Amino acid sequence: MELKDDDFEKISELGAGNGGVVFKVSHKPSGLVMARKLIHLEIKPAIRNQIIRELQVLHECNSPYIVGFYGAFYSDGEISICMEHMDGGSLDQVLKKAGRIPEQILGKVSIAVIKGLTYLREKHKIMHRDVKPSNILVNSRGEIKLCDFGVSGQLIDSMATRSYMSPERLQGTHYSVQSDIWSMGLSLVEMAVGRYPIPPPDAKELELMFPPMAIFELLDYIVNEPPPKLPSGVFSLEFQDFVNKCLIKNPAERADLKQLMVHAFIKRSDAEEVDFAGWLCSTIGLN
Ligand SMILES: Nc1ncnc2c1ncn2[C@@H]1O[C@H](COP(=O)(O)OP(=O)(O)OP(=O)(O)O)[C@@H](O)[C@H]1O
Ligand SMILES: O=C(NOC[C@H](O)CO)c1ccc(F)c(F)c1Nc1ccc(I)cc1F
Ligand SMILES: [Mg+2]
Question: Which positions does UniProt annotate for K-252a binding?
Answer without folding.
Answer: 84-86, 134
